[PDB]
Amino acid sequence: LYRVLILNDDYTPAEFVVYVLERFFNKSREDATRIMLHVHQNGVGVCGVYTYEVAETKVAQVIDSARRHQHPLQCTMEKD
């Protein structure tokens, strides 16, 4: 399986990161907030764990959403 990560940056609004986590990773508001804070403080955080193709899909959906909303948010994946 493969974990999907988001990386911190100084441009993407916190509220957008929460939105991404809720929408694309089905996080509750509190859990999304938790992960958003963790990424802000530590530079990176885990959004979910999926089979390879599904991880690729989620990474792509996040990047598509971010860029269309004019945010440079970086999303990537690693073997879990």
Residue 44 Cβ, how far from its own copies at the closest point, in Å? 5
Residue 64 Cβ, how far from its own copies at the closest point, in Å? 17
Write phi, then psi, for 13 (nearest 5 degrees): -65, 140
Say whether residue 64 binds its own copies (CB under 8 A): no
| Residues 6 or more apart whose Cβ sits within 8 Å of residue 21 | 27, 31, 32, 35, 36, 47
Q: Find tokens 């809720």 and name the residue.
A: 22
Question: Which range binds Mg ion by CB under 5 A, 12-20, 29-37, 58-66, 70-78?
Answer: 70-78
Binding to its own copies in span 3-62, by CB under 8 A: 5, 7-8, 42-46
Residue 5 Cβ, how far from Mg ion at the closest point, in Å? 6
Q: Which residues make up the interface to Mg ion (CB under 5 A)? A: 78, 80
